[PDB]
Amino acid sequence: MSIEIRKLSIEDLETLIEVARESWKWTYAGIYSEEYIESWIREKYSKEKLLNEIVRSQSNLDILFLGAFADSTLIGFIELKIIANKAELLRLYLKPEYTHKKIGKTLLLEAEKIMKKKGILECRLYVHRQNSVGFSFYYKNGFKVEDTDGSDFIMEKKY
Numbered sequence: 358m359s360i361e362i363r364k365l366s367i368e369d370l371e372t373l374i375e376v377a378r379e380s381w382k383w384t385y386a387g388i389y390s391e392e393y394i395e396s397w398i399r400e401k402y403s404k405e406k407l408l409n410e411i412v413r414s415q416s417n418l419d420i421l422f423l424g425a426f427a428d429s430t431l432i433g434f435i436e437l438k439i440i441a442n443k444a445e446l447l448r449l450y451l452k453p454e455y456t457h458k459k460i461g462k463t464l465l466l467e468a469e470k471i472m473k474k475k476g477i478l479e480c481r482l483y484v485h486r487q488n489s490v491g492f493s494f495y496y497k498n499g500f501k502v503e504d505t506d507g508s509d510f511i512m513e514k515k516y
């Protein structure tokens with residue numbers, strides 16, 4: 358299969374939401390209710406907010422928003438928020454069927470390459486403690502737990 362990584366653009370908006378929704382329902386099956394997730398997707402992944410984030414990424418401002426496209430179809434994404442010379446990994450979600458094929462590792466490595474080009478040398482993230490899929494992926498990619506906050510572990514990786 359042919360997997361391409363690039364910045365999202367506004368035309369990706371609808372497939373973006375559908376991927377976010379499908380990944381969330383799978384990822385948080387053990388953890389949140391069907392309705393909580395649907396509410397979160399409708400409030401946080403709203404067309405208006407995602408569009409503003411997609412634009413901020415396009416304008417090389419404080420967001421970096423990339424997608425993984427399999428033969429021209431969005432199957433996953435990563436989103437980073439930059440403040441000063443520190444990045445926070447906000448979101449990294451793949452369609453469940455495309456997991457465990459190193460597409461997420463590839464998203465992560467491309468984001469890392471762009472960050473290093475901008476002189477950013479530190480990435481922090483929030484991962485729910487019961488999300489073993491994500492958590493295990495993170496420590497297998499060099500992230501280390503530095504703290505907790507509520508239900509989440511705060512993990513960090515330095516370059």
Ligand SMILES: CC(C)(COP(=O)(O)OP(=O)(O)OC[C@H]1O[C@@H](n2cnc3c(N)ncnc32)[C@H](O)[C@@H]1OP(=O)(O)O)[C@@H](O)C(=O)NCCC(=O)NCCSSCCO
Pocket residue numbers: 380384446447448449450451452455456457458459460461462463482483484488489490491492493494497
């Ligand atoms: C977490 C995601 C993005 C990881 O991307 P990949 O699936 O491409 O991971 P790989 O690079 O192939 O690495 C494989 C390792 O990752 C774990 N893994 C991956 N898929 C799994 C499935 N289907 N079941 C169980 N474990 C899985 C394993 O640790 C695996 O290593 P080995 O088993 O080979 O040793 C991706 O899986 C994904 O999108 N997951 C759901 C969403 C999610 O959890 N996202 C990140 C946390 S929320 S967001 C950012 C803020 O933290």
Ligand code: NI
Pocket residue numbers: 457
């Ligand atoms: Ni595995």
